[PDB]
Amino acid sequence: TLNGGITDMLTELANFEKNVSQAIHKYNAYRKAASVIAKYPHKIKSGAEAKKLPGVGTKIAEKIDEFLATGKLRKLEKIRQDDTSSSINFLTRVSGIGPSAARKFVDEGIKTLEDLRKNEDKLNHHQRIGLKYFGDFEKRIPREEMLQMQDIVLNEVKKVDSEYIATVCGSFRRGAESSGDMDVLLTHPSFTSESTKQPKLLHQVVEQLQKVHFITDTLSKGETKFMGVCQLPSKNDEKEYPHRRIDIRLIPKDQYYCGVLYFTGSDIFNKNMRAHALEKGFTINEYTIRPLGVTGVAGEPLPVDSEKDIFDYIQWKYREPKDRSE
DNA sequence: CCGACGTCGCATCAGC
DNA sequence: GCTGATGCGA
DNA sequence: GTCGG
Ligand SMILES: Nc1ccn([C@H]2C[C@H](O)[C@@H](COP(=O)(O)NP(=O)(O)OP(=O)(O)O)O2)c(=O)n1
Ligand SMILES: [Mg+2]
Ligand SMILES: [Mg+2]
Ligand code: NA
Ligand code: NA
Prior knowledge:
Elements lengths: L3 H18 L2 H15 L8 H5 L6 H13 L3 H8 L1 H9 L7 H9 L5 H6 L6 H8 L1 H5 L2 E2 H18 L4 E4 L1 H4 L4 E2 L2 E6 L13 H11 L3 E7 L3 E6 L13 E7 L5 H9 L2 H13 L2 E3 L4 E3 L15 H7 L13
Parallel strand pairs: 4-7
Antiparallel strand pairs: 1-3, 2-4, 5-6, 6-7, 8-9
Helix pairs in contact: 1-2, 1-4, 1-6, 6-7, 11-13
Bound molecules: the ligand Nc1ccn([C@H]2C[C@H](O)[C@@H](COP(=O)(O)NP(=O)(O)OP(=O)(O)O)O2)c(=O)n1, magnesium ion (2 copies) and sodium ion (2 copies).
It binds 3 DNA strands through helix 2, helix 4, helix 7, strand 5 and helix 15.
């Protein structure tokens, strides 16, 4: 927490560029810089000192000098007083409302929470659930609740078919004391890179979790990815738990290590690792690591028998999940 | 300087 | 309906 | 916005 003021400022600039300017690579730039500063183990004294870090260039060094001298950033102070930016930045906090739909809504005069609640019929299904649980989805999940949720998911999955394996990934697998949501990696021996010997493998699991009233809403659902809402059960006279976001990803059982590497994250860790892979002549997705030809076309999948095999290919020392929180 | 920035699933829409 | 592009998100 | 060719 040494450089919290600086990393907050950068994150808010990143959010501005994503939501308002619609400049994804500036969003990624600010986020990478925020990340590299967050793990820097000194209280930063100057923009110059920060500029030595990879991802911090001239412009962010100048903003850090301003922030350190004054405690504020004029650029942000203006963004905060702009009405369209404030409106757009608010609307994009609803799940399913991105930068384009947020700017469209403002254009139509829909720009507050009360506007959204009067105009549900202008929301698609994902956005309407995001509005429904707007407050709940802002709350973090204590790891103790994550452990209860893990218990339910794993036991309900076992009841469907004892050959399922469910692994909780994301920030939970990295050991976080609180999580934004729950991420569940699912495998089953009938679904491999070579064949799908059983249909509805994801569906059967979703259905069981709805049957026990753990899953309460569905944001999207395909053959391999489910995005929805869940809720722990509460006891008599107890206030209910908040509703939580839950993502379930069915991955071919022989591609578990690539899948669990992907789903463990962090998101910035994945970006950095896949960028480094490219620099080493490989491409990594959630299924495989493959060589790059000089052509520039991916080759055949390389053998992978642990997450560490993937690190070895790109000549990275292994990093445990808890050390991937970039 | 300047091209290039990780990789993909599901929802939705345009065009045929 | 199919295909491909765009939005949004993991 | 940053960085490597
Ligand atoms: N842009 C993104 C977003 C997510 N992911 C992967 C890495 C994440 O750890 C995993 C799940 O995404 P997530 O739930 O939004 N983030 P994560 O679980 O790390 O932290 P929380 O905010 O959920 O506590 O998907 C990715 O590879 N690229
Ligand atoms: Mg998560
Ligand atoms: Mg998630
Ligand atoms: Na730098
Ligand atoms: Na949003």
